[PDB]
């Protein structure tokens, strides 16, 4: 069981809505992990925002979230973190350097090349699709790396 937690700011956009499409990819692909989500930032009275939910709601996915902080115990916990952003990747990395060894950001760790998730910060739910679709391309391409 493999121990994956996407990371952003506010853990409401981004990293829940990469927490529900790899869950259910993983699922598709017979691959065994414990998935979850959390943000640098984040507030813990949060819920994923509107276009998030409806986004995944379109593709039949439910994104059912609380927003929760990154924690140390969540840091040990993981085998893998995958940052949304570069920057992400380095807040990280300061407040949790005893394990840097598990950061990455999501399109380094798939891609082999440095890049940030399309934000989708103040867009329509249009622009939240665009970042589901981008989402969906890399988990589809983790799940298929993570079973090796």
Same mark, same amino acid.
């Given at each position: 069981?493999?121990?994956?937690?996407?990371?952003?700011?506010?853990?409401?956009?981004?990293?829940?809505?990469?927490?529900?499409?790899?869950?259910?990819?993983?699922?598709?692909?017979?691959?065994?992990?414990?998935?979850?989500?959390?943000?640098?930032?984040?507030?813990?009275?949060?819920?994923?925002?509107?276009?998030? %939910?409806?986004?995944? =709601?379109?593709?039949? !996915?439910?994104?059912?979230?609380?927003?929760?902080?990154?924690? @140390? &115990? *969540?840091?040990?916990?993981?085998?893998?973190?995958?940052?949304?952003?570069?920057?992400?990747?380095?807040?990280?990395?300061?407040?949790?350097?005893?394990?840097?060894?598990?950061?990455?950001?999501?399109?380094?760790?798939?891609?082999?090349?440095?890049?940030? %998730?399309?934000?989708? =910060?103040?867009?329509? !739910?249009?622009?939240?699709?665009?970042?589901?679709?981008?989402? @969906? &391309? *890399?988990?589809?391409?983790?799940?298929?790396?993570?079973?090796?």
């Amino acid at each position: 069981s493999m121990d994956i937690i996407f990371v952003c700011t506010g853990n409401t956009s981004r990293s829940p809505m990469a927490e529900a499409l790899f869950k259910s990819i993983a699922e598709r692909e017979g691959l065994n992990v414990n998935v979850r989500s959390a943000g640098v930032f984040a507030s813990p009275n949060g819920k994923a925002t509107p276009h998030a %939910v409806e986004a995944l =709601f379109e593709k039949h !996915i439910a994104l059912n979230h609380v927003s929760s902080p990154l924690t @140390e &115990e *969540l840091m040990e916990s993981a085998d893998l973190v995958l940052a949304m952003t570069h920057q992400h990747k380095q807040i990280i990395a300061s407040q949790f350097g005893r394990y840097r060894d598990k950061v990455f950001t999501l399109k380094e760790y798939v891609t082999g090349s440095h890049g940030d %998730v399309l934000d989708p =910060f103040g867009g329509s !739910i249009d622009i939240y699709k665009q970042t589901r679709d981008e989402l @969906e &391309e *890399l988990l589809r391409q983790l799940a298929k790396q993570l079973k090796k």
